[PDB]
Design a protein around this motif. Structure first.
Motif, PDB file in Angstrom:
ATOM      1  N   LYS A  44       0.820  -1.221   0.000  1.00  0.00           N
ATOM      2  CA  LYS A  44       0.000   0.000   0.000  1.00  0.00           C
ATOM      3  C   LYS A  44       0.850   1.267   0.000  1.00  0.00           C
ATOM      4  CE  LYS A  44      -3.704  -2.358   2.473  1.00  0.00           C
ATOM      5  NZ  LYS A  44      -3.963  -2.808   3.861  1.00  0.00           N
TER       6      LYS A  44
ATOM      7  N   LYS B   3       5.663 -10.632 -32.569  1.00  0.00           N
ATOM      8  CA  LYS B   3       4.471 -11.237 -31.966  1.00  0.00           C
ATOM      9  C   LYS B   3       4.845 -12.416 -31.072  1.00  0.00           C
ATOM     10  CE  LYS B   3      -0.127 -13.138 -32.503  1.00  0.00           C
ATOM     11  NZ  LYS B   3       0.090 -13.775 -31.178  1.00  0.00           N
ATOM     12  N   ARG B   6       6.327 -11.468 -27.714  1.00  0.00           N
ATOM     13  CA  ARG B   6       5.282 -10.964 -26.798  1.00  0.00           C
ATOM     14  C   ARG B   6       4.381 -12.090 -26.281  1.00  0.00           C
ATOM     15  NH1 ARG B   6       3.070  -5.179 -29.376  1.00  0.00           N
ATOM     16  NH2 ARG B   6       5.015  -4.136 -29.490  1.00  0.00           N
ATOM     17  N   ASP B   7       3.996 -13.039 -27.136  1.00  0.00           N
ATOM     18  CA  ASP B   7       3.251 -14.245 -26.738  1.00  0.00           C
ATOM     19  C   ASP B   7       3.970 -15.036 -25.627  1.00  0.00           C
ATOM     20  OD1 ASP B   7       1.603 -13.464 -28.988  1.00  0.00           O
ATOM     21  OD2 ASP B   7       2.222 -15.144 -30.229  1.00  0.00           O
ATOM     22  N   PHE B  14       2.439 -13.770 -16.704  1.00  0.00           N
ATOM     23  CA  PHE B  14       1.105 -14.068 -16.168  1.00  0.00           C
ATOM     24  C   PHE B  14       0.958 -15.525 -15.706  1.00  0.00           C
ATOM     25  CE2 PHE B  14       0.596 -10.240 -18.869  1.00  0.00           C
ATOM     26  CZ  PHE B  14      -0.047  -9.375 -17.969  1.00  0.00           C
ATOM     27  N   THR B  18       1.757 -17.004 -12.006  1.00  0.00           N
ATOM     28  CA  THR B  18       0.603 -17.617 -11.323  1.00  0.00           C
ATOM     29  C   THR B  18       0.908 -19.033 -10.811  1.00  0.00           C
ATOM     30  OG1 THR B  18      -1.020 -16.317 -12.538  1.00  0.00           O
ATOM     31  CG2 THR B  18      -1.866 -18.277 -11.605  1.00  0.00           C
ATOM     32  N   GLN B  19       1.733 -19.817 -11.512  1.00  0.00           N
ATOM     33  CA  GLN B  19       2.231 -21.101 -11.002  1.00  0.00           C
ATOM     34  C   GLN B  19       3.277 -20.914  -9.892  1.00  0.00           C
ATOM     35  OE1 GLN B  19       3.125 -23.533 -14.651  1.00  0.00           O
ATOM     36  NE2 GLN B  19       1.293 -24.605 -14.210  1.00  0.00           N
ATOM     37  N   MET B  22       1.489 -19.831  -6.593  1.00  0.00           N
ATOM     38  CA  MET B  22       0.797 -21.024  -6.091  1.00  0.00           C
ATOM     39  C   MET B  22       1.770 -22.033  -5.460  1.00  0.00           C
ATOM     40  SD  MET B  22      -2.582 -20.794  -6.245  1.00  0.00           S
ATOM     41  CE  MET B  22      -3.000 -22.544  -6.032  1.00  0.00           C
TER      42      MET B  22
ATOM     43  N   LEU C  68      -8.056  -6.417   4.214  1.00  0.00           N
ATOM     44  CA  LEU C  68      -7.363  -5.163   4.535  1.00  0.00           C
ATOM     45  C   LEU C  68      -7.053  -4.964   6.042  1.00  0.00           C
ATOM     46  CD1 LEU C  68      -9.298  -2.989   1.924  1.00  0.00           C
ATOM     47  CD2 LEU C  68      -6.879  -3.480   1.826  1.00  0.00           C
ATOM     48  N   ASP C  71      -3.282 -22.060 -10.440  1.00  0.00           N
ATOM     49  CA  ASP C  71      -3.744 -22.346 -11.818  1.00  0.00           C
ATOM     50  C   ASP C  71      -5.270 -22.251 -11.880  1.00  0.00           C
ATOM     51  OD1 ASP C  71      -1.160 -24.731 -12.921  1.00  0.00           O
ATOM     52  OD2 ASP C  71      -1.280 -23.611 -11.013  1.00  0.00           O
ATOM     53  N   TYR C  72      -5.829 -21.045 -12.012  1.00  0.00           N
ATOM     54  CA  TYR C  72      -7.282 -20.884 -12.206  1.00  0.00           C
ATOM     55  C   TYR C  72      -7.716 -21.088 -13.668  1.00  0.00           C
ATOM     56  CZ  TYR C  72      -7.110 -18.946  -7.398  1.00  0.00           C
ATOM     57  OH  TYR C  72      -6.941 -18.753  -6.064  1.00  0.00           O
ATOM     58  N   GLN C 107      -7.269 -10.576 -15.878  1.00  0.00           N
ATOM     59  CA  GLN C 107      -6.304 -11.477 -16.530  1.00  0.00           C
ATOM     60  C   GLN C 107      -6.989 -12.635 -17.281  1.00  0.00           C
ATOM     61  OE1 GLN C 107      -2.619 -12.265 -13.807  1.00  0.00           O
ATOM     62  NE2 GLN C 107      -3.897 -10.926 -12.660  1.00  0.00           N
ATOM     63  N   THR C 110      -5.402 -13.025 -20.822  1.00  0.00           N
ATOM     64  CA  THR C 110      -4.253 -13.928 -21.001  1.00  0.00           C
ATOM     65  C   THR C 110      -4.648 -15.382 -20.804  1.00  0.00           C
ATOM     66  OG1 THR C 110      -3.451 -13.202 -18.819  1.00  0.00           O
ATOM     67  CG2 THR C 110      -2.358 -12.312 -20.707  1.00  0.00           C
ATOM     68  N   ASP C 114      -3.582 -18.059 -23.606  1.00  0.00           N
ATOM     69  CA  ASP C 114      -2.776 -19.190 -23.114  1.00  0.00           C
ATOM     70  C   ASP C 114      -3.481 -20.570 -23.226  1.00  0.00           C
ATOM     71  OD1 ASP C 114      -1.291 -16.829 -22.235  1.00  0.00           O
ATOM     72  OD2 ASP C 114      -1.649 -17.264 -20.093  1.00  0.00           O
ATOM     73  N   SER C 188      -3.781  -9.365 -31.091  1.00  0.00           N
ATOM     74  CA  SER C 188      -3.211 -10.352 -30.148  1.00  0.00           C
ATOM     75  C   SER C 188      -1.678 -10.304 -30.008  1.00  0.00           C
ATOM     76  CB  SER C 188      -3.705 -11.762 -30.493  1.00  0.00           C
ATOM     77  OG  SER C 188      -3.322 -12.120 -31.810  1.00  0.00           O
ATOM     78  N   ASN C 189      -1.066  -9.203 -30.445  1.00  0.00           N
ATOM     79  CA  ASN C 189       0.252  -8.711 -30.036  1.00  0.00           C
ATOM     80  C   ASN C 189       0.187  -7.934 -28.688  1.00  0.00           C
ATOM     81  OD1 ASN C 189       2.223  -8.681 -32.783  1.00  0.00           O
ATOM     82  ND2 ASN C 189       0.112  -8.671 -33.342  1.00  0.00           N
ATOM     83  N   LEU C 190      -0.951  -8.016 -27.973  1.00  0.00           N
ATOM     84  CA  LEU C 190      -1.465  -7.046 -26.984  1.00  0.00           C
ATOM     85  C   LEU C 190      -1.456  -5.583 -27.477  1.00  0.00           C
ATOM     86  CD1 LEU C 190      -0.426  -8.490 -23.500  1.00  0.00           C
ATOM     87  CD2 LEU C 190      -2.309  -9.190 -24.921  1.00  0.00           C
ATOM     88  N   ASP C 191      -1.487  -5.374 -28.793  1.00  0.00           N
ATOM     89  CA  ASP C 191      -1.036  -4.125 -29.401  1.00  0.00           C
ATOM     90  C   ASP C 191      -2.206  -3.237 -29.811  1.00  0.00           C
ATOM     91  OD1 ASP C 191       0.376  -2.075 -30.710  1.00  0.00           O
ATOM     92  OD2 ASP C 191       1.949  -3.504 -31.351  1.00  0.00           O
ATOM     93  N   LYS C 194      -2.227  -1.048 -33.203  1.00  0.00           N
ATOM     94  CA  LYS C 194      -2.446  -1.694 -34.505  1.00  0.00           C
ATOM     95  C   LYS C 194      -3.933  -1.785 -34.863  1.00  0.00           C
ATOM     96  CE  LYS C 194       1.877  -4.317 -35.072  1.00  0.00           C
ATOM     97  NZ  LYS C 194       2.711  -4.163 -33.856  1.00  0.00           N
TER      98      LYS C 194
END
Lengths: 51, 49, 363
Positions: A44, B3, B6-7, B14, B18-19, B22, C68, C71-72, C107, C110, C114, C188-191, C194
């Motif tokens: 924070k 590309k 970045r993939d 991410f 995340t693994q 966990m 305060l 693998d999902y 997320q 992704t 993925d 899907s380049n996260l771009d 474009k």
């Protein structure tokens, strides 16, 4: 192999031993709360500078 | 080529992270229980003494 | 063994209800056997209720305020495979589970890349395609809760997908790709710098082609107001506006005429309710502001013809046959600047000490 042993014949040494080695387990449980809570302050402070 | 890098960088930042978290959390859950079982071991092996 | 297999057996029934939906969309080519499906379908529905009742303690200020003070991917993807389930009461459960899951993560964008983004995006598209024949009017007073729950579970699907795209456009810190950008087909380049892919099916290609369907506007005015707020946001973010307005001019050059034509006609229909007029006039603001960025930055020969032959139609042009109208003044009086004289609620005279408890600020 522990949780299949008999509870028979427990003594003054065993009762205070069961009390103090469970106090050692409680210490790590109470440490991990403080590690999480103090990370729950650092994250924070970092968010507040980055706003 | 731009590309596909970045993939692969998304997979690292991410899914692999995340693994990793966990596994970091599951290590703490195992370390607390290593202390549970070793406290119970020392009580058990020292009983009646 | 039997003290990890609980959640493990629940996940196996989410997987097996996808094995079964794939086998039933095949075997409907033969099955007089519907009577044997129902126990597996309702078991799947109850599982999707129970997972939602594990999220509806974390979808809560008291829990986050407790966090305060202290693998999902496979689960989310085996739920996403049910988005086009043969029962809308399962489809809508999968989509509203994915809504809560994106609120905790930002997320699912992704997690879908993925995996197989094609087999996931096509299930959202298959739910956003408009079927004009799924229609008989809600003008009948005799609101059976059984038939109405099925029609609600149907028409809630496109509204929940639109609100999932809207959430992931309201929650942008600048340049972040999101599940909205994924569903709209942004590169899907996260771009976000474009252009869009022409002639492709994304939710964007369907949003604009549903907006220019006059029957979709007449039947679903609040969904069209929402769809126009998607178009407006994609045209007013300082990054995506260029890809967006270019894609409007390359695949949809009529858009600012045909949308004003359809909205103005849908407002002109007397006997409409104040809540249809609400959304159509809200939608008309978004068309004006989206057109305003297009005129400011991307002024084209179609915009010069639109302004000079329709909005500001100069008199001499009326006499050339060699190819009430939508002019600047006929647009103004379509908004009806007689505002309603809002009477003060009688409840504020019963409970004056509770005015600020009985209101909510929209911000």
């Amino acid at each position: 192999k522990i949780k299949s042993s008999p509870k028979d014949n427990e003594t003054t040494a065993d009762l205070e031993r069961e009390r103090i080695y469970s106090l050692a387990t409680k210490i790590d449980d109470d440490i991990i709360k403080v590690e999480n809570k103090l990370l729950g302050v650092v994250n924070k402070i970092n968010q507040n500078q980055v706003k | 080529a731009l590309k596909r890098m970045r993939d692969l960088e998304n997979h690292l930042n991410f899914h692999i992270h995340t693994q990793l978290e966990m596994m970091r959390k599951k290590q703490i859950e195992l370390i607390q229980r290593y202390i549970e079982v070793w406290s119970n071991l020392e009580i058990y092996q020292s009983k009646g003494k | 063994q039997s003290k990890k297999t609980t959640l493990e057996n629940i996940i196996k029934i989410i997987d097996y209800s996808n094995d079964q939906s794939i086998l039933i969309q095949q075997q409907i080519q033969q099955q007089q056997q519907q009577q044997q499906q129902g126990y597996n379908q309702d078991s799947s529905r109850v599982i999707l209720n129970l997972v939602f009742q594990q999220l509806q303690q974390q979808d809560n200020d008291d829990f986050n305020l407790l966090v305060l003070k202290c693998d999902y991917s496979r689960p989310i993807v085996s739920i996403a495979k049910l988005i086009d389930h043969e029962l809308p009461a399962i489809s809508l459960r999968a989509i509203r589970l994915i809504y809560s899951f994106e609120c905790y993560t930002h997320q699912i964008s992704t997690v879908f890349l993925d995996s197989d983004p094609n087999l996931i995006l096509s299930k959202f598209i298959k739910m956003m395609e408009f079927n004009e024949s799924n229609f008989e009017d809600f003008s009948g007073t005799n609101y059976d809760q059984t038939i109405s729950f099925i029609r609600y579970a149907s028409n809630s699907v496109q509204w929940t997908i639109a609100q999932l795209i809207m959430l992931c456009l309201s929650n942008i810190s600048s340049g972040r790709y999101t599940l909205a950008h994924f569903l709209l087909g942004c590169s899907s380049n996260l771009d976000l710098s474009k252009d869009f892919i022409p002639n492709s099916k994304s939710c964007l290609t369907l949003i604009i082609k549903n907006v220019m369907n006059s029957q979709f506007v007449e039947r679903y005015p609040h969904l069209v107001d929402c769809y126009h707020e998607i178009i407006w946001k994609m045209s007013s973010d300082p990054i995506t506006w260029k890809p967006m307005i270019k894609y409007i001019q390359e695949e949809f050059p009529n858009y600012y005429h045909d949308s004003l034509l359809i909205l103005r006609n849908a407002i002109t229909i007397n006997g409409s309710s104040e809540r249809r007029t609400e959304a159509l006039i809200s939608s008309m603001s978004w068309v004006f502001k989206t057109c305003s960025i297009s005129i400011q930055n991307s002024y084209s020969i179609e915009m010069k013809q639109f302004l000079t032959r329709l909005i500001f139609p100069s008199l001499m042009n009326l006499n050339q046959p060699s190819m009430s109208p939508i002019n600047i003044l006929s647009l103004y009086n379509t908004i009806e600047f007689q505002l309603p004289e809002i009477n003060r609620p009688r409840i504020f005279s019963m409970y004056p000490n509770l005015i600020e408890y009985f209101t909510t600020n929209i911000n």
